[PDB]
Design a protein around this ligand. Structure first.
Ligand SMILES: [Mg+2]
Ligand SMILES: [Mg+2]
Ligand SMILES: [Mg+2]
Ligand SMILES: [Mg+2]
Ligand SMILES: [Mg+2]
Ligand SMILES: [Mg+2]
Ligand SMILES: [Mg+2]
Ligand SMILES: [Mg+2]
Ligand SMILES: [Mg+2]
Ligand SMILES: [Mg+2]
Ligand SMILES: [Mg+2]
Ligand SMILES: [Mg+2]
Ligand SMILES: [Mg+2]
Ligand SMILES: [Mg+2]
Ligand SMILES: [Mg+2]
Ligand SMILES: [Mg+2]
Ligand SMILES: [Mg+2]
Ligand SMILES: [Mg+2]
Ligand SMILES: [Mg+2]
Ligand SMILES: [Mg+2]
Ligand SMILES: [Mg+2]
Ligand SMILES: [Mg+2]
Ligand SMILES: [Mg+2]
Ligand SMILES: [Mg+2]
Ligand SMILES: [Mg+2]
Ligand SMILES: [Mg+2]
Ligand SMILES: [Mg+2]
Ligand SMILES: [Mg+2]
Ligand SMILES: [Mg+2]
Ligand SMILES: [Mg+2]
Ligand SMILES: [Mg+2]
Ligand SMILES: [Mg+2]
Ligand SMILES: [Mg+2]
Ligand SMILES: [Mg+2]
Ligand SMILES: [Mg+2]
Ligand SMILES: [Mg+2]
Ligand SMILES: [Mg+2]
Ligand SMILES: [Mg+2]
Lengths: 117, 122, 54, 211, 119
RNA sequence: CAUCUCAUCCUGGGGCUGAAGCAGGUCCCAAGGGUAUGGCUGUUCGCCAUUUAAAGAGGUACGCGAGCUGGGUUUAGAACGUCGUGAGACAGUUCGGUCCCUAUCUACCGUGGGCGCUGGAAAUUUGAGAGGAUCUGCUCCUAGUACGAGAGGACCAGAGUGGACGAACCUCUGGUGUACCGGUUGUGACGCCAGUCGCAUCGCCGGGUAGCUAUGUUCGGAAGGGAUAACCGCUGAAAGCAUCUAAGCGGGAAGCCUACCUCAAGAUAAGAUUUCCCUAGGACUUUAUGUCCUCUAAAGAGCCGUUCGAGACUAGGACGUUGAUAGGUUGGAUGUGGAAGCAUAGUGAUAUGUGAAGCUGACCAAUACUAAUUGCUCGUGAGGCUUGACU
RNA sequence: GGGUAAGUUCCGACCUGCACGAAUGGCAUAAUGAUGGCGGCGCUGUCUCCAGCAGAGGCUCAGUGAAAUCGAAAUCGCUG
RNA sequence: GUCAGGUCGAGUAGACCAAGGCGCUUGAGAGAACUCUGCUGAAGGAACUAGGCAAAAUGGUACCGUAACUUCGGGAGAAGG
RNA sequence: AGUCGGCCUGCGCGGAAGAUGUAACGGGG
RNA sequence: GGGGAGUGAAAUAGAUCCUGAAACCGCAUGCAUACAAGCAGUGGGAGCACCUUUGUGGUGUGACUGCGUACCUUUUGUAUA
């Protein structure tokens, strides 16, 4: 809503309608459409949301996982059709909006507390 | 974004631990090597009993960068390290084990083996 | 850093040919007959039929 | 070739069904009104003069008032000419309108606009000059030009020497852009890529001349 | 470049600038008519009018916000007892800025800032 | 930071070959573009390492210190070897050792004012001309074909994807974001508790909206036409033959002219089109675009104001009440991350609820609340003459 | 020979010492040195390659008001 | 040469304050290049350069631990945790 | 049906590549 | 600081006071000057203005045009950069 109404009307015709309510600190599974040529399949990318940007069609969220000993960060565009599905496994209890400090912790130090009703 | 003097982790079992890029190949005045680019390296650290010795000038291919790869949908994929895989004189991977994940930009005829041996292909 | 010849008086005047001043925009106020600078308050505190410091 | 006059409304993205994200610029196209047609017998060249937008009547001089009243159009905020050919002038006529449906999806176009003005700029920003060393005994010259010539032959500075000066705010054409969408109900073009200027600036869209 | 940027500098650090506009707003709320330089007067709108908008509703949290932005207890009292109630149904525009010639020692252009329904 | 030459390093076009193909050797034409990063050394050079299509040769005060540096060399200190009785010295070596100038003129890069342009004005333009750009790799296909004993391995033509360079832009990815939010140390103050301000590099730390920006994103060097270089000709005499040449007719290059982009009528040859404005009286002779007096003040321009994604100042763009130009207000969006107060639990630090709350520069949209005035100045009164055409 | 992918420097050797050498001392030496040379870890805008921001000048306005220089100037280019 | 308070502090270091004294005798705008002085900076990390010049970095207290070599004192706050 | 190739000479041709701009008739020509 | 008035033979003899030069700096009038390249003059020369005259006159200016690289010193020789 920081844009002109015409840009808004254009970018609102392609918003996704069913997105889960996730916040930074939540562990999520993102299904990603992969094309190995003619084959179409889903890949699961599971990790902690460390950043979440709210811009309507320009929204995004960063997910950090630790695969095979190596840290991987993936930024997903929320309304991209390659994001087939987002599933919230567990919710975290953080005190900031960006958990960039997790980039410098490992293992026991990088644990996030679980949010409980 | 690998340039000359960058140090890389070796993402295979060829015997090297640390390498250092001394040339970005494929064009005059070429500055950087991204994931999938071929690189001239020198071996800085090696395991004691290996096929690769410290001081060897070799080829390698970049498989992980901290700067990240763009995807057509607008995504970035970043890794916590820079990693390369040593190759032959004719640009073929000399490894039998790949460590850590890799990306699908390596899905070509020459690097098929790297994909087949990787524990995870992002 | 410095001139090699003294500049003639004619070139000095030709340089100053752009130095002239302009008059200001003055209007006669109708509520006081006064002359003031346009869009400015008068020195008596009047502006467009309104008074400051009665 | 006849084109459109629009306004850069801003940038967005369009997601394709295959997941590709496409950076796009939205051009708002108030339907252009043909004010004049220039032919060979009267002007010495063929062109279509068109107006778009609106201008309040107190900002329209009497000359332009009569020039718009001769045609059957209302005063716009700017008037522009397009150099055309015959057989590109068949159903064109004064008082007619040239709308957004003159373009097709996938058609390649050139967009002309006025680039953003950066004011007075030095060699580094304006000519990609290299800076001198920041700290190795370097004196008070880091972003300066360096040498501007040679010694006593020629004993002058050559014309076209790249120096500091005013940068930007020029007329720029980007060729080879693709029409991503033609919304005729919103009177909007959506083109792939970046177009010169700031949001709200005037842009000319023409069919590509490279062909 | 300065494209779309808001705010002034006036040859002061941001601490000095914040302090000086605090002082100016206190002075204006106390006298309701002051004479200052024209650029200072034009930036004083963006500082002093949100204070009145804040003082329209009288809560302890609002009075504490007003004190944090003015650090003057008499200014807060006057905002919430006089100036707030006065401009209750006025939608902005509580200040009036009028150009007032030039300073003698400076030739700096001047302006009067006054409150709208004062006196 | 350059600019030129061509005796060409690559790329382009050819002749010959001890030219099978691939690849070379050599000569001719060709200066459009391009033409490494490092280790050593004060080095230029050179050697080496690894690239590249290539890592050209030169001129320019061995281009460039009123642009930078000061490692070498060539002041004064000191030492070694050597020479000298010595003061001292060097076919030498070693450690250390102040780099001034606010730019008048020319030049150059930008940006204005004046006047001119055969009455004035507001627009839109033509293009004489000028500048910019001009590079190239690899893969696939043709085709494992032509060629070759095999090995190997094409021309021509097509498609794709790169490097370097350039431009624009900020949707994305990031950076910054000292007027946005939060945490926290010390100290002082607000009477005090609470709350929250000042100062400590923005105190420090963590995020971050616009704008700007690259490392981000898109685009560019496409195709064509004309005249040619070397070269290849056709027909053809001089010279019964031959012969590209004398007559005549062709082909032919990254080069030339166009073509693409930008500027451009101070192009004084000052161009074109559309529209708009001005139609009053007298007197006096120097009898002529003559002078003075009265009446007139247009189209429009400027001053001034609110301003701007425009800007050093300018200029340029928008608006000035019959108005959204700026601010404010309202709503939204965003960012931050759970305000204060109160309650509750706890010995307390603290936690929870009220409530994703509170606050939120620069954004979007509405909204005359504040400020853009009632004005003034400039710009005139139908635009000389001579010919020729229509009238 | 070592060190580096690559070392005119460095270190260890060799001895062909142009032209070392024993109180103008020879060869070593713990500690010490704002001492000379070389190498490494960390760290970095030193750099690739620069971007943003803050303050102070620069710029505009008001006030005050220098300097060196200077035969006189109606003070362009190119080729000679 | 003398005096020299508070909080914390080993301190006459330092941060903020008291008593006391001051705002440094041109200002106002604007917020271009360029210069100076700072702050931050993706990826890399000496490839810079004559030379890591300059910057960045380290940094307190207690405890553990500390090599070669040595003139037996050191080295040594070695290093590091 | 004239043709061949030797001399001696007048005037021409090639041999003939450079760096700011034609630039080796002062220029137009 | 000045304008009058007054004094004085005189006040552009008024105290920065006899005379009051030049450089240098104003204002007024006439003519020239915004398509044109250089030691700034010289030879010619239209036009305009003002005086006068019945001028083949005078005074100012100078469109256009041919020619034309200061002076001194020192030198074999200097526009000499
Ligand atoms: Mg004069
Ligand atoms: Mg200095
Ligand atoms: Mg400096
Ligand atoms: Mg703004
Ligand atoms: Mg100042
Ligand atoms: Mg501060
Ligand atoms: Mg040649
Ligand atoms: Mg070298
Ligand atoms: Mg030189
Ligand atoms: Mg030296
Ligand atoms: Mg961006
Ligand atoms: Mg940003
Ligand atoms: Mg308290
Ligand atoms: Mg203090
Ligand atoms: Mg708001
Ligand atoms: Mg708080
Ligand atoms: Mg070295
Ligand atoms: Mg000796
Ligand atoms: Mg002896
Ligand atoms: Mg002796
Ligand atoms: Mg080294
Ligand atoms: Mg001249
Ligand atoms: Mg010359
Ligand atoms: Mg102290
Ligand atoms: Mg960095
Ligand atoms: Mg980093
Ligand atoms: Mg180096
Ligand atoms: Mg170097
Ligand atoms: Mg240092
Ligand atoms: Mg430091
Ligand atoms: Mg006298
Ligand atoms: Mg006298
Ligand atoms: Mg003239
Ligand atoms: Mg002599
Ligand atoms: Mg001599
Ligand atoms: Mg002579
Ligand atoms: Mg002389
Ligand atoms: Mg001279």
């Amino acid at each position: 809503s920081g844009k002109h109404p015409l840009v808004q009307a254009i970018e609102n015709s392609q918003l996704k309608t069913d997105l889960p309510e996730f916040a930074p600190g939540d562990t999520v599974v993102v299904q990603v459409k992969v094309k190995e040529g003619d084959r179409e399949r889903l890949q699961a990318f599971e990790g902690v949301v460390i950043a979440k940007k709210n811009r309507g069609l320009n929204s995004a969220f960063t997910v950090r996982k630790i695969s095979s000993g190596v840290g991987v960060e993936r930024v997903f565009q929320t309304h991209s059709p390659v994001v087939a599905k987002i599933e919230v496994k567990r919710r975290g209890d953080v005190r900031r909006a960006k958990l960039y400090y997790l980039r410098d912790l490992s293992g026991k130090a990088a644990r996030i507390r679980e949010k409980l009703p | 974004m690998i340039q000359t003097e960058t140090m890389l982790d070796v993402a295979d079992n060829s015997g090297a631990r640390r390498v250092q890029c001394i040339k970005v190949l494929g064009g005059s005045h070429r500055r950087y090597a991204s994931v999938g680019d071929i690189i001239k390296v020198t071996v800085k650290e090696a395991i004691p009993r290996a096929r690769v010795k410290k001081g060897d000038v070799m080829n390698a291919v970049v498989v992980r960068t901290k700067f990240g790869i763009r995807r057509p949908d607008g995504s970035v994929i970043r890794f916590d390290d820079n990693a390369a895989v040593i190759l032959n004189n004719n640009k073929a991977p000399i490894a039998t084990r790949i460590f850590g994940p890799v990306t699908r930009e390596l899905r070509t005829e020459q690097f098929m083996k790297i994909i087949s041996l990787a524990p995870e292909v992002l | 850093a410095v001139q090699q010849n003294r500049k003639s008086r004619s070139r000095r005047d030709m340089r100053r040919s752009h130095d002239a001043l302009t008059e200001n925009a003055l209007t006669v106020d109708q509520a006081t007959g006064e002359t003031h600078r346009r869009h400015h308050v008068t020195k008596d505190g009047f502006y467009r039929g309104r008074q400051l410091f009665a | 070739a006849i084109g459109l006059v629009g306004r850069k409304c801003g940038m967005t993205r369009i997601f394709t069904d295959a997941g590709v994200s496409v950076p796009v610029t939205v051009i708002e196209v108030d339907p252009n009104r043909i004010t004049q047609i220039k032919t060979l017998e009267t002007d010495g060249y063929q062109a279509v003069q068109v107006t778009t937008g609106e201008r309040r009547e107190s900002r329209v001089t009497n000359a332009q008032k009569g020039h718009f009243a001769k045609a059957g159009v209302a005063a716009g905020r700017l008037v522009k000419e397009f150099r055309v050919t015959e057989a590109e002038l068949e159903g064109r006529e004064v008082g007619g309108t040239i709308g957004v449906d003159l373009f097709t999806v996938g058609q390649i176009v050139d967009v002309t606009g006025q680039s953003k003005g950066k004011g007075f700029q030095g060699g580094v920003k304006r000519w990609n000059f290299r800076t001198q060393d920041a700290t190795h005994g370097n004196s008070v010259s880091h972003r300066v030009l360096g040498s501007t010539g040679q010694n006593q032959t020629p004993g002058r500075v050559f014309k076209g020497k790249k120096m500091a000066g005013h940068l930007g705010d020029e007329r720029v054409t980007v060729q080879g852009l693709e029409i991503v969408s033609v919304d005729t109900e919103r009177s909007v073009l959506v083109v792939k890529g970046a177009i010169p200027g700031a949001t709200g600036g005037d842009v000319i869209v023409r069919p590509t001349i490279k062909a | 470049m300065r494209h779309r940027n808001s705010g002034v500098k006036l040859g002061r650090t941001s601490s000095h600038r914040k302090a000086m506009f605090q002082n100016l707003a206190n002075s204006l709320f106390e006298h309701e008519l002051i004479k200052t330089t024209l650029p200072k007067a034009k930036e004083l709108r963006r500082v002093a009018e949100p204070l009145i908008t804040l003082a329209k509703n009288d809560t302890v949290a609002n009075r504490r916000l007003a004190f944090a932005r003015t650090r003057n207890a008499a200014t807060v009292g006057k905002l919430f007892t006089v100036l707030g109630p006065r401009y209750k149904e006025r939608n902005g525009g509580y200040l009036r800025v009028l150009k007032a010639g030039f300073r003698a020692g400076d030739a700096a252009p001047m302006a009067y800032v006054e409150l709208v329904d004062r006196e």
